[PDB]
Each structure stands twice: as structure tokens, then as C-alpha cells.
Design a protein around this ligand. Structure first.
Ligand SMILES: [Zn+2]
Ligand SMILES: [Zn+2]
Lengths: 181, 176
């Protein structure tokens, strides 16, 4: 088992995909992450199952953070997008709660690209609005681990997947009478 | 425990309120329900606790449910519901920018067996599907289509201030 497969397999991390480590091997992708997560190299090795080095517990955390931040970049590359598109087709991220979006499958998104500013939310292509995950096992995931441009990039590479707009809409009525507004 | 209290207490019936039986005693409220639910009077007694055809029940629920939809249009009903609203009994709007605005139960139709009860957001003014599954077997008709409105059109002070914020898509800090 890889550190990564283990992570992505944990409960609450259903929204993540396994980042190809080739991507991680290209130092050019990790630009500026070093000046962002504590124990950078120590955490980077841990993610790569490389040599460790006394509560080396706080490391796993920075490994999460690091992994998380890398993920946000990865899913902008075609492979990442492909892996995510697959989880999309599997409904891994849930479906739009809005009644008239008829369970349109959602995509994970971040309200900010800066860490620790907001927990990952859910985007609906149909709606084009963002919602809060119904599960709580997802109320501790940083939106920054997904970013703000991911959902868009995906659809701006796979347009055939964009949904047809809602054939129906909510129409308020008191007794069969359309109330306005 | 009274049948009604028993019912409203079951799991999955958190959205219901206890209908004052005085209301039930006025035959004028039950107009046309008799030609809608099977074993009408048998089911009506059961609801009032009056002394495998455990179907006399399936209809008690239906009947109760249909009565409920009417009840919550009366001030008492509205009051009891408004209370459950203040308690968040119906959940909050999933929409991120509605900042957990508490919702109200609603029906997409007043006709039975046509759609399961959905959730209305005053802020949003849109309807959503309950996140729990224990609510995916409740008829919207037991709540009706005009209830949320009636409530707010009697308790305006409760209408929410519109969203101070909105979703703004961006690729890299760039509104797109
Ligand atoms: Zn939607
Ligand atoms: Zn709302």
C-alpha cells in the first residue's frame, strides 16, 4: 500500500483522487508549497513512503496538508481531471440537493485557494451554485485541497459533460394559484 | 400515548405537528377526504383512539397526513410549525450562501402519492430534497404547496434578509 492509497481510502476522503507521483517527482509542480507547510521535506518523503525522519504525529498532518495542496494542482492537469471525471461519473461527490436539478451529480470545489479558510463545498454544473456536503465526514476538508477553478477546468476540457439546463423550475402556489413573488 | 402523539413521535415523522382534535371534530374540515382514503370512518376512529387488516392504519396515516396539510394553514397549525421552525426541525438550506437558513416542509403537489415532501428556503425561495432518507417516504401532500407561504404571510417578521453574498466563480482570482 502507498501512503497515498491509504490516505485516499480513509473515511472522509472520498473526494480525493490518487495523485500520480510522477507529477510529484517534478519539482516544478511543488513551487511555493515548501514555504507553506511545516516540515516540508519530512512530509514530502512520508507521502512518497520514503525514509522517515518523538511524536511523529504532527508530520502525518503536514503530509496531509502537503498532499492536499498538491492535489489541488494535480486535478488541473488532464490526468487529474480524468481521474476526477471518473469519480464524477461514479457520483463520488454526491448530487445537487436542489429539487429541480434532478440529482445532477456535483463536483468538489474550494471557495478559496488559500489553506484554512473554508471547507470544501459542492458545485453543481446544472445549478452553477455551490452547496455544503450533507455528510459531516467532509466538514473537515480544506477547500484549498481542491481549489476554485477545478470544476470549471474539467468542463472546459469535457464540454460534452456539461448538463442541459433545468426543464423545470419551482413555482410557488397557494391553492393552485401561481403566487408572485 | 394518544395515536396522534404516537405517530408524530415515530422516526421519519419529525416534520409533522400534532393536529388539535377539536379541528378534527369539525366535520367541515374533513370535506372530501372520505372519498379519498380507504376505510374512512374506520381510520378516523383509529386516529381519535375510539375503540393484518392493519390497513385500517395505513389509511390512518394517510388520513392524518391529509388533515395535517389543512391544519397547518390555520393559525394554531402555523404556530406549532413556526415553533418547529425556530427549532430547526426541518433542517437548513444546503445552499452555501444562504448561511444555513432554516427551511420549512412543502409539497410539490396537493394530490397524494405524487411526490415526497421537499424542503423550502425563504431566503432562496427554491425547494430542496431532504438529506435524510427517513424522509423519502413522506408525501408532500401531507404538507401541501401553500403552507410555507401562508406561514410567512402571517409572520412577515420572520422572512429572511436576502443573501449579503453570492457565489462568484473564478479560475485564478479572475472572475470567469
Ligand atoms: Zn444544481
Ligand atoms: Zn436557501
Amino acid at each position: 500500500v502507498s501512503w497515498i492509497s491509504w490516505f485516499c481510502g480513509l473515511r472522509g476522503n472520498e473526494f480525493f483522487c490518487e495523485v500520480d507521483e510522477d507529477y510529484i517527482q517534478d519539482k516544478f509542480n511543488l513551487t511555493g508549497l515548501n514555504e507553506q507547510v511545516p516540515h516540508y521535506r519530512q512530509a514530502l518523503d512520508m507521502i512518497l513512503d520514503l525514509e522517515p525522519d518523538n511524536q511523529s504525529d504532527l508530520i502525518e498532518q503536514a503530509a496531509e496538508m502537503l498532499y492536499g495542496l498538491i492535489h489541488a494542482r494535480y486535478i488541473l492537469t488532464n490526468r487529474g481531471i480524468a481521474q476526477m471525471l471518473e469519480k464524477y461519473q461514479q457520483g463520488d461527490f454526491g448530487y445537487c440537493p436542489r429539487v429541480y436539478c434532478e440529482n445532477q451529480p456535483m463536483l468538489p470545489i474550494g471557495l478559496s485557494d488559500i489553506p484554512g479558510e473554508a471547507m470544501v463545498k459542492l458545485y453543481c454544473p446544472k445549478c452553477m451554485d455551490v452547496y455544503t456536503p450533507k455528510s459531516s465526514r467532509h466538514h473537515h476538508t480544506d477547500g484549498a485541497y481542491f481549489g476554485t477553478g477545478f470544476p470549471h477546468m474539467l468542463f472546459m476540457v469535457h464540454p460534452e459533460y456539461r448538463p442541459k439546463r433545468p426543464a423545470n423550475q419551482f413555482v410557488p402556489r397557494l391553492y393552485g394559484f401561481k403566487i408572485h413573488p
